[PDB]
């Protein structure tokens, strides 16, 4: 069952809290130190629970949120599953599906090195179940998707696997034994006993990818760092619509006619073989991987598409509800472009004017805008997909509406002109979206290192029977130093009260306090900035007045880019540059999406300063029907989770460096706003022994002897740091 | 006990006294049925806006 | 041009003859067919029937006459257009509320923040002058710190009430009766004449 | 505020209930649809022999 060692006095902190969560079947939330291995925590015990079965019954579904730290959950647990192993004496059956999807996906040299990987999957599906479905037998055109072929053949076949794999793993076994990771994987869900994958791939309602079977007897899923919730489940319901998509789906419109034109009876007489079917018995001919290839469900909590064939008929005429649609989407697009306008039913009132009958045929459209086009099995998906966009849209403008909200945004960002307009539908109830998750499953566990504030899980708007502040004790001398800055002598201004450009005189000692920083703290520095233009304003008096002159001469630098391309190559440097004759200080943003799937080490990044209040201060009006809606739930919410936001984001990017427990962190806070807010956003555990013992308004240049003081002690030699033997009762 | 319940509804000191005819489903739920008026300590019952000009116009013509 | 037919759309692609003819055509004569097969939909069948011809006439096929002298001559062609009469009378009642509603609340709600900013504001600022003039010419028994503690902590807790005096609509009990406005019934019981019958009459006898 | 009539249509208004007790129910209804057929047909007699212009 894993001690294996002093553990910290944390899996005892956290042994009851599973036979808490679990055999009470507790929904459940933990507070977890960033200090502490996510799943030698966790798995430990679940992986204990999976052995442990109760009544009888125990899944696994676990999920995260980066693809590299999912296979650094399956890394260690292999001699986690080779640990009691040997010590229970011989070993059971077992298996963990990594399932990226759409990551890792052909063999085969030609499709595989095209870089992105939904349009790829297109040429993929296309043929396989669109060239090869349609055109069955044949030599050339069938060309050679033999790991298909060979996934049908072991279809028949019942082998059995080993342990669990990894994504580079079926792509060797490509050229061997595997049948590729999209079936191998499909029939490995069928006597799957752990599942580990996206938080995003779970989280699809627009391809709803309903992962196992609707099996809520005992559903088990873990669920860490689940911090932006909504920055998921809002997003995964947010809907783009470009106005060159439009003219492009314009001139694919009359271009589809000329698939319509030149086809007569053959691919025609093939739906009047099945359109009456639709009519007669219900049943999509579509449900081998094309279900997940085309919008599986849109608006998940429904009941059934009962009255499929909705008011429309014919395909041409069904392809006029499309040019009653879209020409009347931009009549619905162009107008409005001067006006941002938030009117989410009021929109489909209007548009009923407009469309002859609605309701059912926004509903009913997407499966008969793809049904229609699997009579042809032609068009390449990557050209279709700005089509598939719009039929999903209409359709969650049909379904959920009035809890949810429509926002145009045609003016300024990124194009300076009016030069492309575009429009969003959001949804708001990320409950609604977590709600079907919660009814489909039994009652599972957030565990976020970053959550100080419970009350945040009513923004989930949920019930919860176990939520607790997990305390863990510091005998490694001292875990960390937070250190609030607030100079006295260059005046703390480090909100942006005087905004990032509206003046430098604020920016004149962030290089001071940055540099001196820098001349005192070695081994890598990742700091955190706030946007890529705020980072652009960061560094843009730093050039032409003289900053790095002694920064370059110091360590060195690590821009981070608005493209993930160059974005990634200081990193190939940062984790090189840190572990040779440098310090080489990395600069980075926390909003960014450079602030997940690392875990920094002892060895490479052990310090972070805070640069501002890390909020949003971006997307306008998005706020302010989310602001309404909470305070048609909890009415006294502007203030308070306008706060949160940047501490939930703060902690998850700044409480990264500290592993294990000895791994060091220099986490300080040049801020402003302190007095309740980082207060309140710091964990409960880390604001009580660490943050302003009595130090708050530390000027860096006093500030600089306390990292002197840390550290110099702190890297002395460690004899001893809370060892655990036998058990002691302690009783915390 | 919620039913027929006639109750005051406006009232002037010396003279003006309204009553009200309501029927009640249940608390905070009340249906006005009729209403009674009294001038001068003589009862009359409210006329409809529509009957009174029903008979008006029948007797002109 | 008959009589210099020009229509007027405000958008990328009005040009599209045939949609703008099928817009106004489909729109008028079809929405009595929606009132008359989709208002009692067997199944789909009857929304099928509609666009059946709604094609039919879409593609300048001039088989129109045909169904023109057979449009309403086997219904009632008053019932056609009561439903429309129905429908129209429905939905601007419909639309016009759900305007209202919300130009009412969040209106309601905006000045229920203003008055709880006027709340807040004047409380503070009144209640530490009447705490100025208390901290003064006072008895304070104990020493000169009583009830201006009494004071300094009465006021924290009065933050909170008061909420329901900074707004009242008005009136609607003694200026008028006539705020009711919004009316609803709607009730039913089905309970009554139960256990009139007599006869339990029993016996193994004559 | 006053609704109830002078005596002169009160006596026209019982002289019109002693009519209603007399034809009644199913005379009525016979009575009120030959009304209606008949006026019907009269009045498209006329429209159509105005019809010729
Ligand atoms: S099925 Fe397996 S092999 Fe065939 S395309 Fe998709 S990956 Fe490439």
């Known amino acids: 069952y894993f001690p294996y060692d002093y553990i910290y006095p944390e899996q005892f902190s956290y042994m009851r809290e599973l036979k808490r969560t679990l055999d009470a079947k507790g929904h459940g939330v933990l507070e977890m130190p960033s200090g502490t291995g996510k799943t030698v925590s966790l798995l430990a015990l679940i992986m204990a629970y999976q052995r442990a079965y109760p009544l009888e019954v125990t899944k696994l579904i676990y999920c995260s949120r980066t693809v590299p730290e999912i296979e650094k959950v399956i890394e260690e647990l292999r001699k986690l599953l080779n ?69 049908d053949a072991h279809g028949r076949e019942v082998p059995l696997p080993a342990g669990i794999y990894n994504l580079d793993d079926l792509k060797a076994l490509g050229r061997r034994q595997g049948w590729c990771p999209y079936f191998l994987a499909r029939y490995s869900i069928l006597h799957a006993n752990v599942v580990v994958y996206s938080y995003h791939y779970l989280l699809d309602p627009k391809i709803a990818d309903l992962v196992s079977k609707e099996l809520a007897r005992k559903a088990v899923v873990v669920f860490d760092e689940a911090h932006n919730i909504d920055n998921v489940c809002i997003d995964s319901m947010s809907v783009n619509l470009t106005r060159r998509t439009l003219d492009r789906c314009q001139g694919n419109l009359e271009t589809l006619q000329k698939t319509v034109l030149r086809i007569k009876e053959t691919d025609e007489q093939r739906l009047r073989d099945e359109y009456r079917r639709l009519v007669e018995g219900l049943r999509e001919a579509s449900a081998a991987r094309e279900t997940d290839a085309h919008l599986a469900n849109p608006v998940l909590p429904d009941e059934v598409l009962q009255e499929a064939v909705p008011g429309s008929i014919r395909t041409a005429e069904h392809f006029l509800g499309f040019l009653r649609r879209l020409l009347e989407y931009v009549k619905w697009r162009l107008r409005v472009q001067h006006v941002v306008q938030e009117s989410p039913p009021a929109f489909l009132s209007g548009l009923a004017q407009r469309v002859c009958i609605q309701r059912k045929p926004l509903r009913f459209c997407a499966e008969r805008l793809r049904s229609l086009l699997h009579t042809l099995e032609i068009t390449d998906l990557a050209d279709f997909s700005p089509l598939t966009l719009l039929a999903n849209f209409a359709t969650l403008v049909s379904t959920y509406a009035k809890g949810f909200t429509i926002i145009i945004e045609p003016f300024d960002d990124r194009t300076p002109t009016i030069a492309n307009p575009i429009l969003h539908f959001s949804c708001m109830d990320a409950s609604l979206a977590i709600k079907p998750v919660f009814e489909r499953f039994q009652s599972v566990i957030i565990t976020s290192g970053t959550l100080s504030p419970l009350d945040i899980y009513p923004k989930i708007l949920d019930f919860h029977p176990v939520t607790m502040a997990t305390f863990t004790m510091t005998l490694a001398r001292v875990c960390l130093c937070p250190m609030i800055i607030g100079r006295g002598n260059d005046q703390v201004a480090i909100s942006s009260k005087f905004e990032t450009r509206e003046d430098i005189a604020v920016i004149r000692n962030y290089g001071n306090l940055l540099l001196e920083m820098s001349a005192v703290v070695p081994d890598g520095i990742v700091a955190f900035f706030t946007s890529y233009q705020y980072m652009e304003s960061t560094v843009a008096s730093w050039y032409e007045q003289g900053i790095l002159e002694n920064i370059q001469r110091n360590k060195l630098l690590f821009i981070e880019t608005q493209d993930g391309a160059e974005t990634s190559v200081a990193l190939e440097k940062y984790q090189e540059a840190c572990e040779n004759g440098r310090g080489a200080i990395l600069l980075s943003v926390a909003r960014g999406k450079v602030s997940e799937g690392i875990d920094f080490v002892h060895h490479y990044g052990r310090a972070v300063i805070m640069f501002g209040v890390p909020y949003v201060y971006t997307q306008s009006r998005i706020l302010k029907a989310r602001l309404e809606y909470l305070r048609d739930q909890f009415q006294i919410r502007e203030n308070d989770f306008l706060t949160f936001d940047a501490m939930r984001h703060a902690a998850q990017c700044v409480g990264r460096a500290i592993r294990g427990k000895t791994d060091y962190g220099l986490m300080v806070f040049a801020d402003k706003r302190f007095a309740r807010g980082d207060k309140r956003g710091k964990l409960p555990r880390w604001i009580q022994e660490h943050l302003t013992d009595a130090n708050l308004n530390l000027t860096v240049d006093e500030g600089v002897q306390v990292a002197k003081y840390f550290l110099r002690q702190m890297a002395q030699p460690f004899h001893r740091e809370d060892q655990l033997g036998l058990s002691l009762l302690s009783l915390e | 006990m919620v039913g027929i319940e006639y109750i005051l509804l406006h009232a002037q000191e010396p003279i003006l006294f309204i009553i009200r005819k309501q029927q009640r489903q249940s608390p905070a739920q009340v249906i006005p049925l009729a209403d009674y008026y009294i001038i ?8 409809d806006l529509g009957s009174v000009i029903n008979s008006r116009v029948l007797t002109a013509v | 041009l008959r009589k210099s037919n020009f229509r007027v759309q405000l958008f990328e692609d009005p040009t599209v003859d045939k949609e703008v003819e099928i817009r106004k055509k489909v729109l008028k004569i079809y929405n009595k067919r929606e009132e008359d097969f989709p208002s009692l939909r067997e199944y789909n069948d009857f929304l099928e029937e509609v666009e059946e011809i709604v094609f039919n006439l879409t593609n300048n096929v001039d088989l129109d006459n045909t169904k023109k002298k057979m449009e309403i001559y086997q219904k009632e062609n008053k019932d056609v257009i009561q439903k429309n009469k129905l429908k129209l009378t429905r939905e601007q009642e419909e639309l016009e509320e759900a305007l209202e509603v919300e130009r009412q609340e969040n209106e309601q709600r905006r000045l229920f923040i203003q008055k709880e900013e006027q709340l807040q504001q004047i409380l503070k600022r009144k209640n530490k002058q009447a705490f100025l003039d208390e901290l003064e010419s006072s008895d304070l028994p104990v020493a000169l710190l009583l009830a201006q503690h009494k004071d300094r902590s009465t006021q924290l807790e009065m933050q909170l009430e008061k909420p329901k005096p900074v707004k009242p609509v008005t009136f609607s009990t003694g200026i008028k009766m006539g705020q009711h406005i919004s009316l609803a019934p709607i009730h039913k019981l089905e309970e009554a004449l139960y256990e009139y019958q007599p006869l339990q009459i029993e016996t193994y006898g004559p | 505020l006053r609704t109830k009539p002078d005596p002169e ?12 007790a007399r034809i009644g129910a199913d005379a009525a209804q016979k009575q009120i649809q030959s009304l209606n057929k008949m006026c019907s047909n009269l009045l498209e007699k006329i429209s159509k022999e105005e019809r010729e212009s």
Do not use: M, W
Request: net charge negative; glycine share 6%.
């Open chain 1, 83 to 151: 640990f009691y192993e040997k010590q229970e004496g011989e070993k059971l059956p077992f298996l963990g599906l990594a399932l990226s999807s759409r990551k890792n996906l052909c063999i085969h040299p030609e499709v595989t090195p095209l870089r992105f990987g939904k349009d790829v999957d297109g040429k993929c599906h296309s043929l396989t179940a669109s060239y090869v479905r349609a055109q069955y037998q044949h030599d050339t055109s069938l060309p050679h998707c033999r790991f298909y072929e060979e996934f």
């Open chain 2, 40 to 47: 001068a300590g003589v009862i009359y019952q409210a006329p």
């Open chain 4, 9 to 20: 249509v009160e006596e026209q208004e019982k002289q019109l209930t002693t009519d209603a």
